[PDB]
Design a protein around this ligand. Structure first.
Ligand code: ADK
Length: 231
DNA sequence: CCCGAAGTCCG
DNA sequence: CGGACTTTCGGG
């Protein structure tokens, strides 16, 4: 079965505007885990727009198919395009898509893809269906996969006043001993972000609970100005 | 335009 | 460790 024509068209159009000179530092930035075509985000978005203008966005029945086919292509720009495309089908995504989103998190995994999947798409789903959190988060925490663990930490990143504090701190407590950089940093990030909403609770937490030095330092990067640094 | 959010380099 | 800096991106 041939590649979906929309994907084939995107592949052709991206490839015609590839930039090998730019591709080398872009690939190095991601620790050479991926090939790159060398197309940065402003141009990449315009080339996608070009293809939508000519071909129109595929019927929703092909949504998951399109995403998978782009996910399977070697160059990283195709996963970036896939996430742009998924945003265009946002109003069709619901709680039944959690396993589909899971599979995206654990394939071609790195911080760029996982950070674009988790606080937005998964975050919105669990905000609407908080009863489903306990069907997934304990498995993610227990998994060997650091990107599922990072997802458990970051899905609440944008919740602000809707943050489930008890849940957040329980998750962090489960992962605080991790020696993985991307876990320590994710803990630091979610705490720093939540501190913008509730600085007192974050300050109390970091002063009275074990964290990696990296996590604590990232957590209080801003609020240490409000509380001061004791001699 | 502005600010806030991985990577290298060096002490 | 972790500060000083890098370029890119999201969002205002
Ligand atoms: C991706 N990226 C680029 N530049 C910075 N200064 C950053 N801080 C966090 N993430 C960053």
């Amino acid at each position: 079965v041939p590649m979906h024509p929309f994907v084939k068209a995107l592949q052709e159009h991206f490839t015609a505007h590839q930039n090998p000179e730019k591709a080398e530092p872009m690939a190095r930035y991601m620790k050479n885990h991926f090939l790159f075509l060398g197309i940065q985000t402003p141009e990449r978005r315009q080339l996608l727009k070009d293809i939508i203008q000519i071909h129109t966005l595929p019927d929703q029945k092909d949504f998951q198919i399109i995403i998978r086919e782009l996910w399977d292509l070697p160059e990283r720009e195709f996963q970036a395009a896939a996430l742009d495309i998924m945003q265009k089908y946002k109003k069709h995504i619901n709680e039944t898509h959690i396993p589909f989103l899971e599979e995206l998190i654990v394939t071609k995994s790195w911080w760029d893809s996982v950070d674009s999947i988790v606080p937005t798409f998964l975050g919105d789903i669990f905000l609407k269906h908080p009863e489903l959190i306990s069907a997934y988060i304990p498995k993610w925490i227990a998994s060997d996969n650091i990107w599922l663990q990072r997802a458990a930490i970051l899905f609440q990143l944008k919740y602000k006043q809707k943050m489930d504090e008890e849940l957040l701190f329980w998750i962090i407590g489960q992962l605080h001993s991790s020696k993985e950089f991307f876990i320590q940093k994710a803990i630091g990030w979610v705490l720093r972000e939540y501190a913008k909403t509730n600085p007192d609770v974050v300050w109390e937490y970091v002063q009275n609970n074990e964290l990696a030095p990296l996590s604590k330092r990232e957590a209080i990067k801003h609020i240490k100005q409000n509380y001061g640094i004791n001699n």
